[PDB]
Amino acid sequence: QVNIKKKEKWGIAHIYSSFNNTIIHITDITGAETISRWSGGMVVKADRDEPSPYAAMLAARRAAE
RNA sequence: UGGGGCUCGCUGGGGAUACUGCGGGCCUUGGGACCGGGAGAGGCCGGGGGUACCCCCGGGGUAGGGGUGAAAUCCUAUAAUCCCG
């Protein structure tokens, strides 16, 4: 780590929004580094719940840690 | 018996001159024509920019994705989707 002056980091979060699935994907402000990728069909077992809001909160909570 | 009409498509002579024909002359209401201002996804030609989709290459990043009412065939593990260049 080369000295940080601000002591705050920023991660732009791309949100790709389908009626077949939801994808949440937060990267660094450049976009050149992928910390974490989590979708709505690892959370669940079935295709119907692949989208919805409830996958699209839980997917966006695992990343967030 | 006497009078009329008859396809009724023909002809000769005289007469009228609105209309029509023809001939001549004359005029701008129609038409055409010109000049100047003017809008438009009219046509053609040359020039040039950006969107998004796809594709290909490098990096980053893992367990999926695709698809449906459910599914399967099919995409992806020499790495897909995704994100960055």
The span from the CA of A64 to the CA of A48, in Å, is: 24
Per the rule left: phi > 0, alpha: psi between -120 and 50, beta: everything else, A7 is left
Separation CA A16–CA A23 (nearest Å): 5
H helices within A1-65, ranges in order? 55-62
* Resolution, angstroms, 1 dp: 5.3
Nearest CA-CA partner of A54 in A37, A41, A64, A35: A41
Give, as ranges, the nucleotides of chain B with any atom within 7 Å of a protein CB: 59-71, 81-85
Residues with CB under 7 A from strand B: A 14, 16, 18, 20-21, 23, 25, 27, 30-37, 39-42, 46-48, 50
